[PDB]
């Protein structure tokens, strides 16, 4: 037998954060976004706790998408219903909706898991530079 | 744009004549003159709307936030508030009549509660048709068809989200538009509408201005009489 490996439970502190998505494109943004939620980076990650730190990206809509997808690749989204096939192309999302663009890309990054539905709420995508967000006091690191 | 809208209360339904020689039903609707309680403008609350409160009643009969709020507002206390999107040429505690606010012959719309039909089933709901029933054709004669879509597991094997089956009917909110308003009458606080109106003898009826055909007057009078002895 031997030693129990260590392992935080409640033992929870987690720090805001920062990012300016001003010209960084979706997926690069994505990924570090997912292990800074998921705290895979913490040098204690114990997987089954929510370690990881909170999110705020600005700027949205100033994010692009590499290559000729702002019209080739498109985000489709299904009711239940026939018929419902809602069909949209990167350049309609980088204008009607843009934070949805990087919630979604962000999200399907998480494990099919119960805490991914509560990790992801911890990313607050704002549209553009503002927010009422400046009473929690995030740090501030570049592309991240 | 600058959507217009009243209330009031439909009290029956009649016919009257016109030049043209044209006979015309009716609907009468009492409308006593209303106060906007509130008024959002664009920037400030992210959109526009003015907000109507209508059936004035005795303070007894009413809840004691709401009265708190007319006594603070400086209103009379009704027991009605609703509002409409879009309504901006009008200011705060003004009284509103429609005479004020509708042309003698234009396009109105109205959006009324219908008329509750109680738990009625498919064929008289979604107009389906009835099995035949000469040549003995079983006593389920009367249902939704059959509600198929695929046999088997690689078809479809369920029925359809928003399918078409038996249910509630009735009282729910509705709208028939382009109803001209042929005229008025100061003394009732009554109006005169066009057309046959939703809702039962009694209820409440909102009139908008059209937005089908939003301006649009085409002038109807009426047949005065010239026969005597
Ligand atoms: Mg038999």
């Avoid at chain 1, 998480?110 to 704002?126: E, G």
């Avoid at chain 2, 009649?14 to 003159?33: A, D, G, M």
Wanted: proline content about 3%; overall charge positive; charged content about 25%.
């Amino acid at each position: 037998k031997t030693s129990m490996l260590t392992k935080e439970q409640a033992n929870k502190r987690r720090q805001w954060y920062i990012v300016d998505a001003a010209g960084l494109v979706l997926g690069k943004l994505a990924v570090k976004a997912a292990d800074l939620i998921r705290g895979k980076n913490k040098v204690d990650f114990t997987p089954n706790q929510d370690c990881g730190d909170y999110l705020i990206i600005i700027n949205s809509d100033q994010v692009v998408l590499t290559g000729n997808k702002k019209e080739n690749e498109f985000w489709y989204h299904h009711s239940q219903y026939i018929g419902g096939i809602k069909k949209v192309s990167g350049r309609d999302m980088l204008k009607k909706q843009s934070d949805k663009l990087v919630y979604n890309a962000v999200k399907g990054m998480l494990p099919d898991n119960r805490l991914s539905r509560r990790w992801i709420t911890k990313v607050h995508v704002f549209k553009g530079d503002k927010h009422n967000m400046e009473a929690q006091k995030p740090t501030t690191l570049n592309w991240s | 744009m600058e959507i217009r809208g009243i209330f009031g209360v439909k009290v029956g339904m009649s016919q009257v004549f016109t030049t043209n020689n044209e006979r015309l039903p009716i609907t009468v609707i009492y409308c006593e003159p209303n106060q906007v309680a509130g008024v959002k403008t664009e920037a400030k609350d992210k959109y526009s709307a003015t907000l109507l409160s209508f059936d004035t009643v005795e303070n007894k009969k009413l809840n004691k936030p709401q009265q708190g709020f007319f006594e603070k507002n400086n209103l009379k206390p009704t027991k009605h508030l609703q509002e409409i999107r879009n309504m901006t040429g009008f200011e705060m505690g003004q009284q509103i009549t429609p005479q004020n606010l509708f042309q003698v012959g234009e396009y109105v719309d109205v959006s009324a509660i219908s008329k509750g039909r109680g738990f009625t089933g498919a064929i008289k709901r979604w107009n389906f048709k009835i099995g035949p029933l000469g040549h003995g054709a079983g006593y389920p004669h009367r249902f939704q068809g059959s509600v198929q879509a695929g046999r088997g597991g690689a078809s479809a094997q369920r029925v359809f989200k928003g399918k078409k089956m038996s249910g509630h009917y009735g009282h729910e909110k509705v709208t028939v538009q382009n109803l001209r308003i042929v005229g008025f009458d100061e003394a009732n606080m009554l109006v005169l509408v066009s057309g046959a109106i939703a809702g039962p003898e009694g209820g409440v009826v909102l009139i908008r201005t059209a937005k089908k055909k939003p301006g649009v007057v085409k002038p109807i009078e009426l047949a005065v009489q010239t026969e005597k002895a």
